[PDB]
């Protein structure tokens, strides 16, 4: 574990002018991360109700608790990727070996992509403060560059499972 604050935090903010903007975009995802994963996986089942049918992959409480875990593990790496600005840790630790794992278990990759697609939609609403149900208080300005970057990190997830 590491901590950065005070005078040392201002040093890391000096390396990139959007240091406050980048940190304000991680605080809109980790504050809503519980609502995001719960809505993504639920929205995956509204679209494809065969997942909670007999023979489904989200039938039984043990499997869906693992499905809910996976969207959280995925989202935590993408949130770390935004804070760090690089996809290196996301690719090396989370996405390397995921698809070979999923085919053996029988996890459907196409519906798994739908959940990641919803979280990417939920992410850019929170970063750009355009959510219809909830708002956050921000200094006035434009974060369109950062919200584009988060979309790119979700597509590395989708590419790795395709």
């Amino acid at each position: 574990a590491a901590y950065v604050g005070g005078s040392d935090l201002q040093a890391l903010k000096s390396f990139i002018a959007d240091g406050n903007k980048r940190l304000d975009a991680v605080n809109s995802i980790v504050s809503n991360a519980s609502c995001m994963v719960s809505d993504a996986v639920s929205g995956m089942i509204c679209e494809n109700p065969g997942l909670i049918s007999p023979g489904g992959n989200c039938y039984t409480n043990r499997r869906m608790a693992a499905c809910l875990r996976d969207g959280e593990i995925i989202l935590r790496y993408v949130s770390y990727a935004l804070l760090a600005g690089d996809a290196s840790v996301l690719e090396d630790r989370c996405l390397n070996g995921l698809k070979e794992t999923y085919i053996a278990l029988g996890v459907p990759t196409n519906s798994s992509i739908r959940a990641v697609s919803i979280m990417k939609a939920q992410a850019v609403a929170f970063i750009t403060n355009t959510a219809t149900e909830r708002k956050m208080s921000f200094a006035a300005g434009d974060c369109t560059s950062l919200a584009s970057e988060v979309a790119s990190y979700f597509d590395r997830v989708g590419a790795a499972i395709s």
Partner: protein, 205 residues
């Protein structure tokens, strides 16, 4: 001259991601109270847990949505699941209404922006005796009755006395001048029958 299991392990280890079977993900928490001395960012690897309790809420609520939706009912025709083996007993009361399912019925509750369905055992009553009082728990819990059998003259013979007479039966000891515990006598009373079939057969002759 080849060890295949050793080659399989070494080839697997040289490519396997160490993190893939551990569910460890980076946690981020940021503190910000509007002063430059308060702001702090920390990161820490932490294993993500499976909350089986909250998984029930998603599974229950969506399956209600999946059943009330009528167009997903045809574009997604779900599969029949065969029920588990439970032995049958021939009485339809325990075959068709076992105690695990018996008396359950869906309560429906409709509110502003909420439709809720709850399966509940429906009890009702008369006086203070309930419908399911027949099946009370064990912690809330005799002689046998015998089988029942199938007048201007009245000054001389009352109705309780008419056609009433003695009745008697015998079994002498089985052997001459010798004791026998199987020997008996019986003395009794009974009302003599009408004998009408024998009286008709005798009247015909």
């Amino acid at each position: 001259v080849v060890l295949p299991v050793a080659r399989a392990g070494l080839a697997a280890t040289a490519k396997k991601n160490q993190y893939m079977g551990t569910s460890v993900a980076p946690e981020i928490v940021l503190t910000d109270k509007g002063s430059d001395m308060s702001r702090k960012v920390k990161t820490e690897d932490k294993k993500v847990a499976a909350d089986q309790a909250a998984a029930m809420g998603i599974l229950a609520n969506m399956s209600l949505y999946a059943s009330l939706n009528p167009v997903k009912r045809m574009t997604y025709k779900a599969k029949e699941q065969a029920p588990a083996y439970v032995k049958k007993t021939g009485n339809p009361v325990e075959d068709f209404y076992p105690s695990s399912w018996r008396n359950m019925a869906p309560v429906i509750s409709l509110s502003a922006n909420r439709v809720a369905v709850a399966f509940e055992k429906i009890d009702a009553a008369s006086n203070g005796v309930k419908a399911n009082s027949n099946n009370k728990p064990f912690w809330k819990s005799n002689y046998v009755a015998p089988e029942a059998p199938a007048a201007a003259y009245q000054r001389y013979f009352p109705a309780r006395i008419r056609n009433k007479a003695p009745a008697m039966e015998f079994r002498r000891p089985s052997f001459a001048n010798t004791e026998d515990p199987s020997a008996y006598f019986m003395l009794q009373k009974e009302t003599v029958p009408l004998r009408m079939a024998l009286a008709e057969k005798l009247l015909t002759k």
